[PDB]
Structures are given as C-alpha cells and as structure tokens.
Amino acid sequence: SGFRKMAFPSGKVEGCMVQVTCGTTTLNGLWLDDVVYCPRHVICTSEDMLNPNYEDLLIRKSNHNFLVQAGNVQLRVIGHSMQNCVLKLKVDTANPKTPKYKFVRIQPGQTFSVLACYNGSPSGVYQCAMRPNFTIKGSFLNGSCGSVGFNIDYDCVSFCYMHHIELPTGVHAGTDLEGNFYGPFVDRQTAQAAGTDTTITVNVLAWLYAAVINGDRWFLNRFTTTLNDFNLVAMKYNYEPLTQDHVDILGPLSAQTGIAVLDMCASLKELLQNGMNGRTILGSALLEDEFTPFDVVRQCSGVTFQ
Amino acid sequence: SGFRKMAFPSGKVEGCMVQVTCGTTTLNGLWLDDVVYCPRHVICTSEDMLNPNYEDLLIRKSNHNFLVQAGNVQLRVIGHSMQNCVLKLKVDTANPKTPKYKFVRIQPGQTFSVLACYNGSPSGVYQCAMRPNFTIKGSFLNGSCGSVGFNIDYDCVSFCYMHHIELPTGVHAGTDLEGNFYGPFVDRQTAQAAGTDTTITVNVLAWLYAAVINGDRWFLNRFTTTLNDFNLVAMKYNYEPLTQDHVDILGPLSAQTGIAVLDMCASLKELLQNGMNGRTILGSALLEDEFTPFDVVRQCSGVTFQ
Ligand SMILES: *C(=N)[C@H](C[C@@H]1CCNC1=O)NC(=O)[C@@H]1Cc2ccccc2CN1C(=O)[C@@H](NC(=O)C(F)(F)F)C(C)(C)C
Ligand SMILES: *C(=N)[C@H](C[C@@H]1CCNC1=O)NC(=O)[C@@H]1Cc2ccccc2CN1C(=O)[C@@H](NC(=O)C(F)(F)F)C(C)(C)C
Ligand code: NA
Numbered sequence: 001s002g003f004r005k006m007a008f009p010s011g012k013v014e015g016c017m018v019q020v021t022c023g024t025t026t027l028n029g030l031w032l033d034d035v036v037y038c039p040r041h042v043i044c045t046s047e048d049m050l051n052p053n054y055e056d057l058l059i060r061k062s063n064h065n066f067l068v069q070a071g072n073v074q075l076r077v078i079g080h081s082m083q084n085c086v087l088k089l090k091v092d093t094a095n096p097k098t099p100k101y102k103f104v105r106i107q108p109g110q111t112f113s114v115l116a117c118y119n120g121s122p123s124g125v126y127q128c129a130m131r132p133n134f135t136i137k138g139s140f141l142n143g144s145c146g147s148v149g150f151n152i153d154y155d156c157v158s159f160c161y162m163h164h165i166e167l168p169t170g171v172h173a174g175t176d177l178e179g180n181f182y183g184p185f186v187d188r189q190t191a192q193a194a195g196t197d198t199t200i201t202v203n204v205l206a207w208l209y210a211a212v213i214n215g216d217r218w219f220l221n222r223f224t225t226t227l228n229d230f231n232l233v234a235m236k237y238n239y240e241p242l243t244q245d246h247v248d249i250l251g252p253l254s255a256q257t258g259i260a261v262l263d264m265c266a267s268l269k270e271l272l273q274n275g276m277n278g279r280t281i282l283g284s285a286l287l288e289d290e291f292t293p294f295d296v297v298r299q300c301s302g303v304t305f306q
Numbered sequence: 307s308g309f310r311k312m313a314f315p316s317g318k319v320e321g322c323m324v325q326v327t328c329g330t331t332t333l334n335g336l337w338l339d340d341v342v343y344c345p346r347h348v349i350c351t352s353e354d355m356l357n358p359n360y361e362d363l364l365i366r367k368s369n370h371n372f373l374v375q376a377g378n379v380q381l382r383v384i385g386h387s388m389q390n391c392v393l394k395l396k397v398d399t400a401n402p403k404t405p406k407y408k409f410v411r412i413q414p415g416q417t418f419s420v421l422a423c424y425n426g427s428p429s430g431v432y433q434c435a436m437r438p439n440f441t442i443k444g445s446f447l448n449g450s451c452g453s454v455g456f457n458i459d460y461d462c463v464s465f466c467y468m469h470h471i472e473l474p475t476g477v478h479a480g481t482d483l484e485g486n487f488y489g490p491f492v493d494r495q496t497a498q499a500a501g502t503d504t505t506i507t508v509n510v511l512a513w514l515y516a517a518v519i520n521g522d523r524w525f526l527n528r529f530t531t532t533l534n535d536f537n538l539v540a541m542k543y544n545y546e547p548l549t550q551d552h553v554d555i556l557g558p559l560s561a562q563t564g565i566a567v568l569d570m571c572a573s574l575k576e577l578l579q580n581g582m583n584g585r586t587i588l589g590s591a592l593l594e595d596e597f598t599p600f601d602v603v604r605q606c607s608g609v610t611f612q
C-alpha cells in the first residue's frame with residue numbers, strides 16, 4: 001500500500017555525470033562512451049548573452065578551451081561539435097560506467113526523473129512532468145544546467161531532458177539530448193515566458209485509479225458521461241482534452257479496478273464542479289496530474305529494473 | 307527556484323542490494339563488506355506467524371538453508387546470527403561496491419530516502435519522514451521487506467531504516483539496521499496498529515521558510531507570539547510541541563530570510579486558525595511537514611555529495 005512521487009533509481013545516471021568548464025562558466029555534462037554532452041551556452045560570456053551567434057563563438061574555440069573533469073580525473077577533449085543547442089565534446093576516454101541507453105524526445109504529459117547536479121556531482125533526484133506548455137516545475141539553482149531527466153526500462157536508460165534555463169515564473173526549460181528545446185524557448189536572454197498551462201487530464205484519471213487501487217473510493221459516483229460531454233467540462237476547468245487514445249491507455253487500470261474510463265470521468269467531473277470538500281485523495285488536497293498511467297501500474301505492481 | 311520532494315541519489319545503495327531466500331520466502335538484503343543484513347522474518351513459515359520463537363526457528367537452520375543472490379551471482383553463506391529483528395548472513399565475498407557507511411537510529415521528524423526493492427532489484431526512490439507515531443507513509447508491496455532508508459552526507463551513506471511490516475491503515479513499520487523497531491511494533495502477526503499521529507511542527511516551519519526563500523510571502527503577517535502561546539495553539543491542532551531546540555535549529559533559515567522564528571510561528575498560527583483560503587504554498591494546498599530544516603537548506607543551497 002501507499003502511493004509516492006517515485007523517481008527511478010539514479011545510479012546508472014550518477015556514473016555518467018561530469019563537470020565541464022569553458023572560460024569562467026562551469027556546469028554539468030553527460031558522459032556516455034567517449035562523448036560528453038552539455039548545453040552549448042557554456043561557451044557564452046556574460047557580455048554576449050542577448051544575441052549570441054553560437055557558430056561564431058564556437059569556431060573561435062579549441063579543444064583545450066574545454067576542461068572536463070570526472071571525479072578528480074581530467075578528461076582530455078580531442079574533438080568538439082555543436083548539435084542544435086548541445087555541445088558534444090569527444091574525450092580521450094570512454095566512460096566505463098556507460099549504461100545501456102537511448103535518447104528520447106518525450107511528449108507533454110510524460111514524466112521523468114531528474115538528477116539535479118552541481119559541479120559534476122549529484123545533489124538529489126525527483127520526479128517531474130513535461131507540462132503541456134513545455135516547461136517543467138523543477139528545482140534548479142545556479143550551476144545546475146546540464147542536469148538530465150530520464151526514464152529507465154529494464155536495463156535501458158532513456159534520457160529525455162537536459163536543463164538549460166529558468167523562466168520568470170521560476171519554472172524550467174531545456175532540450176532533448178539532441179539539443180532541441182521543448183516548447184518555443186531559446187538559449188538567449190530574451191523576454192520569453194511560459195505560456196498558459198493546462199492540467200494533464202489522462203494523468204489525473206490515472207491517479208484517481210491509483211487511489212481506488214489503494215482502497216479509497218469516496219469520490220466515485222454512479223453516473224457516467226460521454227467523452228464529448230466530459231471534454232466540454234474539461235475545457236471549462238483548463239484541463240487538456242481527453243482523446244480516445246487516452247481512454248485506451250487507461251484500459252488496464254479500468255480493467256484492474258472494474259471502473260469504466262468514462263465512469264471515472266464522471267467522478268472527475270463531479271470533483272471539478274464540487275471540489276473535494278476538505279477531503280483528501282492519496283494525501284493530496286489537489287488533483288494530482290504528474291503520474292502517468294504507466295507510473296501508476298509501475299508502483300502498484302512493483303516493476304523493477306535490471 | 308523550485309521546491310521538490312527530493313531524495314538522495316540512490317547509486318551507492320543500489321550496489322548493496324541483494325536477494326535472500328529461505329524456504330519459500332524471498333525478500334531483500336543489504337550487502338556491506340562480507341555481511342548481508344535482512345529481516346529475520348525471512349525464516350518464518352506461514353504457519354508459525356502468530357507467535358514465532360525466532361531463536362528456536364533459527365537454531366534449526368544451517369547456512370545452506372539461506373540462498374543469497376547478487377545480480378546473477380550466488381553468494382555462499384558461511385555464517386549467520388540474529389541481532390534483534392535482523393539476520394546477519396556472513397558470505398564468502400566482500401561487496402566490492404560497499405560505500406563508506408554508518409548505521410544510525412533516527413528521531414521522529416527526521417527524513418530519509420527509501421530505495422524500494424523487489425527480488426534484490428531497485429524499483430524506485432522516494433522521500434519519507436519518520437512520523438511522531440514511529441510509522442512511515444511509504445509505498446511498499448509484497449516482497450519489499452529488506453528495502454532500506456538512508457541519508458547521504460558527503461561520501462557517507464547513513465542507513466537508518468529497514469522495512470518489515472505494513473499496518474492496517476496502510477502505513478509502514480520497520481527497524482534500524484541493528485534490528486530495533488521504531489515504535490512499539492513487533493515482527494509477529496498481532497493486533498498492532500499505528501497510534502494517533504501528530505504534525506511535525508518544526509518541519510512545517512522549515513517549509514514556510516522554503517516558500518519565502520522561493521519568493522512567496524502571502525501567508526506572512528505582522529504579529530509575533532510567545533513559544534508558550536504558540537504551543538497552546540499547536541496542541542489544539544494536533545501539532546507537535548515546538549521546543550527551544552527546534553527554535554535554535556531554525557536559526558539559519560530565520561537569518562537568511564530575516565523572519566524571526568516566533569514571527570513565523572505567528573504566521574503558522576493564523577494559517578491554522580484561518581486556513582489557506584484556496585491559496586497554495588509551494589504548490590500544496592496542505593501544510594507540508596516532511597521537509598526538515600536541513601532538507602530546506604540542502605535544496606535551497608545545492609549541497610552535493612561525493
Ligand atoms: C544553468 N546553470 C542555469 C540554470 C538556471 C539558473 C537559475 N535556475 C536555473 O535553472 N541556466 C541559466 O542561467 C541560463 C543560461 C543562459 C543562456 C543563454 C541566455 C541567457 C542565459 C541565462 N539563463 C537563465 O536561465 C535566465 N533566464 C532567462 O534567460 C529566460 F528567463 F529564460 F529568458 C536567468 C535564470 C534569469 C539567469
Ligand atoms: C515484506 N515483504 C512485507 C511487506 C508488506 C507486505 C505488504 N506491504 C508491506 O509493506 N512484510 C510482511 O508481509 C509482514 C511479515 C510478517 C512478519 C511477522 C508476522 C507477520 C508478518 C506479515 N507482514 C505484514 O506486514 C502484515 N501486517 C501485520 O502483520 C501487522 F499489521 F503489522 F500486524 C500484512 C501486511 C497483513 C501481511
Ligand atoms: Na563561457
């Protein structure tokens with residue numbers, strides 16, 4: 001029993017973290033085989049932040065302008081290239097702790113674990129979702145850039161996020177591991193801001209199912225609803241529309257609990273219209289939307305990783 | 307910016323986890339140097355659960371009754387002993403990934419990271435507090451016993467919890483790594499239950515300070531209060547009494563924010579009397595009490611571990 005915001009075990013990623021320095025700027029890199037991945041803004045100077053031309057800044061650098069440290073050991077940079085907003089530093093040594101891994105670009109509403117790091121050293125691990133507005137509500141301080149987000153599947157670390165910037169509302173923006181930003185954000189100093197966000201409906205539904213699995217039914221009702229009629233209410237409360245694909249993904253949880261998806265939608269509708277009335281669900285007084293259907297199955301079934 | 311329920315990086319503990327089997331019962335063990343620590347109830351049979359005599363059950367076992375597997379590798383048990391409610395299995399091989407470590411018995415109100423494990427394999431990591439009633443609100447399924455809770459300090463893993471039992475309210479009980487239960491719980495099938503719990507006041511105060519550090523002051527007021535008068539209100543809302551020791555521990559956070567501890571207590575009083583009025587603090591509609599003062603400093607300052 002119990003339901004927690006659960007991160008993946010971080011060890012396979014801890015062994016990949018390094019420190020990268022260029023000029024006066026130090027941040028984190030990811031060391032996989034003989035390449036070190038990091039945000040290209042490490043090559044920026046505080047003077048050319050408004051409109052840096054990165055191709056122009058990088059052609060002026062040599063391999064020896066980059067200091068890469070793994071633990072106490074310096075790694076010698078023997079090659080470098082830019083791919084979108086990430087720099088790839090080829091180093092003389094292949095990481096002996098390189099796990100089986102993939103690079104993945106996730107969709108909004110998907111969750112991942114973040115290993116917050118400073119000066120190449122892990123600080124902590126927590127679970128986040130990619131919001132519909134392509135920000136994440138992380139916890140990141142100066143020096144955290146290059147920290148990565150990831151999922152694990154059996155043996156395989158799927159890296160999906162590298163941290164680059166904090167927006168004025170204090171939420172966070174970054175790239176996939178190929179250096180493409182999520183959302184419309186850029187790695188320059190501009191007036192950019194998080195767009196209006198919405199609640200991830202399919203995830204709230206997954207979490208209502210977790211609550212039932214964990215022996216709590218108080219919020220259920222006898223009604224049902226149509227997808228169309230539910231989406232009319234969703235829209236009204238700033239919830240993402242629920243698609244038939246979402247309904248199908250919620251199938252296994254519907255089946256394990258005996259509650260049809262559209263019946264759970266009716267319960268959610270009533271919760272949005274009436275509130276919780278000072279009651280809680282899985283210890284929360286708010287409707288939680290940073291658990292996916294897969295996250296619920298994983299933690300209510302005890303899937304492990306090898 | 308940001309504030310998350312942040313666990314310690316789990317890698318140093320992942321490398322210590324093994325699987326222990328005795329009879330038909332399999333659960334997790336902790337492998338440090340040449341000893342494997344696990345719950346002694348692994349030696350129980352489903353018949354003798356109400357009132358097992360463990361000394362009597364254990365004298366009937368031999369080393370070869372215990373199967374210990376690390377990864378794919380079997381470790382041969384060459385000695386065994388019982389220490390309170392944990393079994394110590396001496397094995398032929400010293401764990402080469404043994405970190406620097408300590409065993410610590412924590413006080414209620416302290417937090418730790420839990421590495422949930424099944425069949426010797428880590429499943430996930432999350433943050434918990436030892437409640438005043440000496441339970442933890444974990445997330446644990448069949449097979450999770452032997453999973454450990456820990457803190458990390460620089461290089462040093464301080465193990466503080468090993469999981470043994472789930473109580474009828476779905477909260478969890480276990481031991482320090484020397485096998486002494488927290489609270490009055492026992493490893494037998496009896497009518498035991500969680501006592502009434504209280505809210506960890508010094509932690510709610512720490513988290514109000516985190517919220518201020520992160521740029522939110524809406525809940526502050528101009529008033530102050532006396533410790534005595536605050537504790538009268540605490541008692542009324544089922545909060546733990548605040549001691550002068552708690553006040554002193556909150557010193558660094560008071561100093562960084564410029565809000566005297568007793569002034570923050572006045573704010574907390576008003577929040578208890580008036581509620582939040584549909585507002586949130588650090589994303590929560592409830593007063594959070596599973597961050598310690600040290601947890602707040604750690605995550606608002608970015609301490610790392612080596
Ligand atoms: C990386 N170490 C750091 C992570 C930040 C610092 C505070 N919390 C975080 O998550 N990233 C930055 O400081 C980036 C780097 C950068 C590259 C190009 C142009 C400008 C910058 C400055 N950075 C910012 O995150 C700044 N925010 C923005 O520029 C904007 F809001 F996105 F527009 C700022 C946090 C104000 C320094
Ligand atoms: C360990 N693998 C398991 C962890 C449990 C299972 C479900 N969630 C958990 O956290 N521990 C047990 O099953 C223990 C073992 C045990 C030892 C001695 C006597 C009885 C037991 C049965 N266990 C329980 O946790 C049971 N609860 C209680 O006995 C009591 F509530 F504490 F009294 C029960 C969960 C009902 C199996
Ligand atoms: Na630079």
Ligand code: NA
Pocket residue numbers: 220221222223224262263264265266267
């Ligand atoms: Na319903």
Ligand code: NA
Pocket residue numbers: 328329330331347348349350351
């Ligand atoms: Na047994």
Ligand code: NA
Pocket residue numbers: 526527528529530568569570571572573
């Ligand atoms: Na005050």
